[PDB]
Tab-separated table of C-alpha atoms and ligand atoms in Angstrom:
chain	number	residue	atom	x	y	z
R	253	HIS	CA	97.673	82.201	126.001
R	254	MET	CA	101.118	81.673	124.529
R	255	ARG	CA	101.258	83.045	120.843
R	256	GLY	CA	103.329	80.634	118.706
R	257	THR	CA	103.058	82.865	115.564
R	258	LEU	CA	104.256	86.440	115.532
R	259	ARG	CA	102.359	88.341	112.728
R	260	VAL	CA	104.905	90.926	111.566
R	261	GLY	CA	103.635	93.927	109.610
R	262	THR	CA	106.107	95.218	107.073
R	263	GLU	CA	106.372	96.880	103.624
R	264	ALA	CA	108.557	95.232	101.001
R	265	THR	CA	109.672	98.079	98.687
R	266	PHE	CA	112.409	99.216	101.038
R	267	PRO	CA	115.733	97.509	100.222
R	268	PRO	CA	117.980	96.677	102.045
R	269	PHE	CA	115.565	96.322	104.919
R	270	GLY	CA	112.630	94.509	103.228
R	271	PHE	CA	112.183	93.623	99.594
R	272	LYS	CA	111.549	90.658	97.296
R	273	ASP	CA	114.189	88.591	95.686
R	274	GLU	CA	113.854	87.153	92.082
R	275	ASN	CA	111.748	84.279	93.382
R	276	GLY	CA	109.435	86.623	95.200
R	277	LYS	CA	110.746	85.676	98.668
R	278	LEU	CA	110.865	88.412	101.313
R	279	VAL	CA	114.427	89.269	102.147
R	280	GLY	CA	116.373	92.006	103.933
R	281	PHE	CA	117.815	93.251	107.184
R	282	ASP	CA	114.407	93.691	108.803
R	283	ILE	CA	113.354	90.244	107.655
R	284	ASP	CA	116.459	88.644	109.168
R	285	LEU	CA	116.059	90.724	112.340
R	286	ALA	CA	112.399	89.585	112.711
R	287	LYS	CA	113.443	85.969	112.361
R	288	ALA	CA	116.260	86.388	114.887
R	289	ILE	CA	113.875	88.070	117.399
R	290	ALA	CA	111.322	85.251	116.913
R	291	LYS	CA	114.097	82.670	117.552
R	292	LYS	CA	114.967	84.408	120.815
R	293	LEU	CA	111.276	84.442	121.796
R	294	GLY	CA	110.861	80.783	120.855
R	295	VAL	CA	108.160	81.541	118.293
R	296	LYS	CA	107.620	81.611	114.503
R	297	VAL	CA	107.246	84.745	112.335
R	298	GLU	CA	104.487	85.168	109.796
R	299	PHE	CA	105.042	88.275	107.595
R	300	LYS	CA	102.133	90.458	106.641
R	301	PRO	CA	103.385	92.780	103.836
R	302	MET	CA	101.168	95.789	103.316
R	303	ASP	CA	101.345	99.398	102.252
R	304	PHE	CA	103.373	101.394	104.732
R	305	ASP	CA	100.826	103.978	105.754
R	306	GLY	CA	98.454	101.240	106.782
R	307	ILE	CA	100.789	99.529	109.193
R	308	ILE	CA	100.002	101.480	112.379
R	309	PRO	CA	96.248	101.010	111.937
R	310	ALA	CA	96.789	97.337	111.199
R	311	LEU	CA	98.572	97.038	114.596
R	312	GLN	CA	95.880	99.025	116.352
R	313	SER	CA	93.082	96.799	114.877
R	314	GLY	CA	94.727	93.474	115.620
R	315	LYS	CA	95.749	92.410	112.177
R	316	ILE	CA	99.419	92.153	113.182
R	317	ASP	CA	101.332	91.693	116.503
R	318	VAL	CA	104.455	93.700	115.748
R	319	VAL	CA	105.906	96.126	113.205
R	320	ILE	CA	109.368	95.672	111.773
R	321	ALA	CA	109.343	98.012	108.756
R	322	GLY	CA	112.227	100.475	109.103
R	323	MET	CA	109.958	102.581	111.184
R	324	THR	CA	111.383	105.740	112.681
R	325	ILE	CA	110.516	106.334	116.343
R	326	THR	CA	108.691	109.700	116.448
R	327	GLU	CA	106.704	111.444	119.147
R	328	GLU	CA	103.541	111.398	116.947
R	329	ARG	CA	103.801	107.664	116.534
R	330	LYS	CA	104.580	107.028	120.215
R	331	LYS	CA	101.014	108.346	120.840
R	332	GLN	CA	99.715	105.438	118.713
R	333	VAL	CA	102.012	102.529	119.392
R	334	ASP	CA	104.797	101.514	121.793
R	335	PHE	CA	108.309	101.145	120.444
R	336	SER	CA	111.291	98.943	121.381
R	337	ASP	CA	114.702	100.414	122.047
R	338	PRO	CA	116.074	101.578	118.729
R	339	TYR	CA	117.661	98.867	116.598
R	340	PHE	CA	119.208	100.908	113.743
R	341	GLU	CA	120.051	104.554	113.151
R	342	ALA	CA	119.355	105.834	109.654
R	343	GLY	CA	119.496	109.210	107.937
R	344	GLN	CA	117.951	110.694	104.801
R	345	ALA	CA	118.993	111.292	101.188
R	346	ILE	CA	117.748	112.941	98.028
R	347	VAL	CA	118.123	111.147	94.667
R	348	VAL	CA	118.356	113.300	91.509
R	349	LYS	CA	119.511	112.910	87.937
R	350	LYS	CA	123.288	113.105	87.460
R	351	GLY	CA	123.122	116.269	85.391
R	352	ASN	CA	121.289	118.084	88.080
R	353	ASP	CA	123.203	120.893	89.771
R	354	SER	CA	120.456	122.930	91.468
R	355	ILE	CA	119.487	120.347	94.171
R	356	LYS	CA	121.905	119.875	97.079
R	357	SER	CA	119.516	119.893	100.100
R	358	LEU	CA	115.872	119.913	101.100
R	359	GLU	CA	115.837	123.725	100.861
R	360	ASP	CA	116.664	123.474	97.112
R	361	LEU	CA	113.414	121.592	96.339
R	362	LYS	CA	111.642	124.958	95.820
R	363	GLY	CA	109.602	124.840	92.628
R	364	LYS	CA	110.499	121.214	91.903
R	365	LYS	CA	108.513	117.950	91.622
R	366	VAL	CA	109.487	115.623	94.508
R	367	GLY	CA	108.379	112.002	95.107
R	368	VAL	CA	107.997	110.562	98.634
R	369	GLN	CA	106.455	107.465	100.238
R	370	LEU	CA	103.103	108.090	101.720
R	371	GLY	CA	103.119	108.081	105.528
R	372	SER	CA	106.930	108.324	105.755
R	373	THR	CA	109.068	110.693	107.745
R	374	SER	CA	110.514	111.855	104.391
R	375	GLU	CA	107.037	112.971	103.436
R	376	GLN	CA	106.965	115.053	106.648
R	377	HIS	CA	110.378	116.509	106.108
R	378	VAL	CA	109.473	117.531	102.543
R	379	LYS	CA	106.107	118.988	103.668
R	380	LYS	CA	107.938	121.177	106.169
R	381	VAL	CA	110.110	122.852	103.502
R	382	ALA	CA	107.307	122.826	100.942
R	383	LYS	CA	105.276	125.349	103.128
R	384	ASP	CA	105.000	128.377	100.767
R	385	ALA	CA	108.174	127.544	98.717
R	386	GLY	CA	106.087	126.138	95.798
R	387	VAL	CA	107.159	122.450	95.987
R	388	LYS	CA	105.108	119.968	94.000
R	389	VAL	CA	104.889	116.850	96.236
R	390	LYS	CA	103.965	113.583	94.708
R	391	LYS	CA	103.143	110.319	96.861
R	392	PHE	CA	103.770	106.553	96.319
R	393	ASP	CA	102.988	103.418	98.216
R	394	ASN	CA	105.519	101.495	96.152
R	395	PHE	CA	108.883	103.232	96.396
R	396	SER	CA	110.172	101.378	93.310
R	397	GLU	CA	107.442	103.512	91.500
R	398	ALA	CA	108.531	106.973	93.123
R	399	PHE	CA	112.046	105.904	91.914
R	400	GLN	CA	110.735	104.997	88.416
R	401	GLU	CA	109.076	108.472	88.210
R	402	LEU	CA	112.534	109.955	88.860
R	403	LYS	CA	114.240	107.738	86.208
R	404	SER	CA	111.457	108.660	83.653
R	405	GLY	CA	111.610	112.380	84.317
R	406	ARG	CA	108.145	112.683	85.863
R	407	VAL	CA	109.684	114.058	89.078
R	408	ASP	CA	112.915	115.983	89.647
R	409	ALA	CA	113.897	114.293	92.964
R	410	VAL	CA	112.836	111.606	95.404
R	411	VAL	CA	113.593	111.554	99.128
R	412	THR	CA	113.893	108.491	101.354
R	413	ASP	CA	116.014	106.967	104.074
R	414	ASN	CA	119.740	106.993	103.119
R	415	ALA	CA	120.479	103.297	102.891
R	416	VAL	CA	117.381	102.801	100.736
R	417	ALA	CA	118.351	105.683	98.424
R	418	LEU	CA	121.802	103.981	97.996
R	419	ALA	CA	120.211	100.574	97.347
R	420	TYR	CA	118.011	102.039	94.564
R	421	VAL	CA	120.946	103.820	92.995
R	422	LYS	CA	123.008	100.614	93.035
R	423	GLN	CA	120.169	98.704	91.406
R	424	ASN	CA	120.074	101.274	88.558
R	425	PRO	CA	123.637	101.764	87.355
R	426	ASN	CA	122.605	102.847	83.848
R	427	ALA	CA	119.822	105.186	84.992
R	428	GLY	CA	121.794	108.259	85.445
R	429	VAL	CA	120.933	109.149	89.062
R	430	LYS	CA	122.907	110.238	92.165
R	431	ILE	CA	122.545	110.930	95.858
R	432	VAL	CA	122.753	114.454	97.289
R	433	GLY	CA	122.043	115.960	100.653
R	434	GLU	CA	122.819	112.793	102.532
R	435	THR	CA	122.646	112.675	106.299
R	436	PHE	CA	123.676	109.667	108.381
R	437	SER	CA	121.543	109.747	111.513
R	438	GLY	CA	118.371	111.225	112.839
R	439	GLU	CA	115.977	108.346	112.019
R	440	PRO	CA	116.162	105.752	114.849
R	441	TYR	CA	114.275	102.620	113.804
R	442	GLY	CA	112.117	100.889	116.366
R	443	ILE	CA	110.005	97.663	116.531
R	444	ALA	CA	106.397	98.604	117.364
R	445	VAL	CA	103.861	96.715	119.481
R	446	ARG	CA	100.292	97.623	120.219
R	447	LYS	CA	100.057	100.288	122.824
R	448	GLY	CA	100.011	98.733	126.266
R	449	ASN	CA	101.449	95.343	125.215
R	450	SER	CA	104.215	95.584	127.834
R	451	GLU	CA	104.832	91.825	128.049
R	452	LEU	CA	105.692	91.511	124.379
R	453	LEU	CA	107.651	94.751	124.417
R	454	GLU	CA	109.860	93.639	127.226
R	455	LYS	CA	110.585	90.327	125.533
R	456	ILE	CA	111.563	92.115	122.341
R	457	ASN	CA	113.808	94.546	124.156
R	458	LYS	CA	115.493	91.685	125.993
R	459	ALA	CA	115.955	89.859	122.649
R	460	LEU	CA	117.542	92.941	121.037
R	461	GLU	CA	119.885	93.422	124.009
R	462	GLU	CA	120.941	89.771	123.810
R	463	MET	CA	121.395	89.861	120.058
R	464	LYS	CA	123.738	92.889	120.500
R	465	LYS	CA	125.783	91.031	123.146
R	466	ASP	CA	126.082	87.581	121.521
R	467	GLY	CA	127.086	88.492	117.986
R	468	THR	CA	123.692	87.826	116.397
R	469	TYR	CA	122.909	91.467	115.534
R	470	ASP	CA	126.392	92.283	114.289
R	471	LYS	CA	126.287	89.306	111.872
R	472	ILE	CA	122.984	90.591	110.428
R	473	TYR	CA	124.434	94.054	110.079
R	474	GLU	CA	127.588	92.773	108.325
R	475	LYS	CA	125.518	90.652	105.982
R	476	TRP	CA	123.655	93.731	104.677
R	477	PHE	CA	126.145	96.526	105.214
R	478	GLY	CA	129.647	94.893	105.409
D	667	LIG	N1	109.277	99.435	104.872
D	667	LIG	C1	109.147	100.726	104.646
D	667	LIG	N2	108.669	101.174	103.510
D	667	LIG	N3	109.592	101.605	105.527
D	667	LIG	C2	109.547	103.049	105.379
D	667	LIG	C3	110.181	103.770	106.555
D	667	LIG	C4	110.466	105.251	106.243
D	667	LIG	C5	110.825	106.049	107.459
D	667	LIG	N4	111.963	105.451	108.242
D	667	LIG	C6	109.617	106.134	108.318
D	667	LIG	O1	109.569	105.540	109.417
D	667	LIG	O2	108.617	106.849	107.928
C-alpha cells in the first residue's frame, strides 16, 4: 500500500514554526518543511493540530504518520518513536518583564512563578532546577496563554525555545517583556515516525538531504529567519 496522504501531527502555538495566520490558516517553518518533504515523497500532507503532549501517543496509536512539531530529539523520546536526522538546531530562552533584574538564567528562577508548555523540554529543564529551590511551575497547552500569564503578571517568567520566545516578544511590542538567558543550540529538532517504520524514515531522511543540497531547505530558512 502506497499512502497518498501524510497525516502530520503538529501543535500550532509555536511561531515561527507552526501557528495560525489572521485567516486561521496554518503557517510556519515546520508547515513549509512538511509540504516540501511531502513534495519530495510525491504525496500530500494533511495536518493534524493537537496539544503537544499528546503528539507522541497519537503517533503510537496510528492517528498520525509523522510528527513535525519543533520536536527536540531526546533519548527518552527515542525509546518511543524514531527520529529523522536533525533538521534545525534551537536553543532556549527565558522571557521576563523589562523591569526585572533578578532573573538572568534558569538558576535564578528560585522562588518564582514560571510558565512552561506541558510535555516540552523546557518543562524538563525547569523541573531540574526547581528540585528543592522552591520554584512554582505552572503548565500550558497553549503557549500564547503561558505568554499571556507573563504579560498579566500571573507568572514572573516563561521558558521556551529561543526562536519562539523572540517571536512572542516581537508580537508584543507594547507588553513590556524581554529575553534573558538565551542559548543558541542544544535542542536539535527531528521529524518523528512510528517506531520501526524504517521505510518512511529513510524516505524522509533522503528528502531532507536533498532539500539541503538543492536549495529548498535554505529558501525555507531564509523565509522565516532571513
Ligand atoms: N509545536 C510545539 N509546540 N512544539 C514544542 C517543542 C518544544 C521543545 N522543542 C520540545 O521538543 O519539547
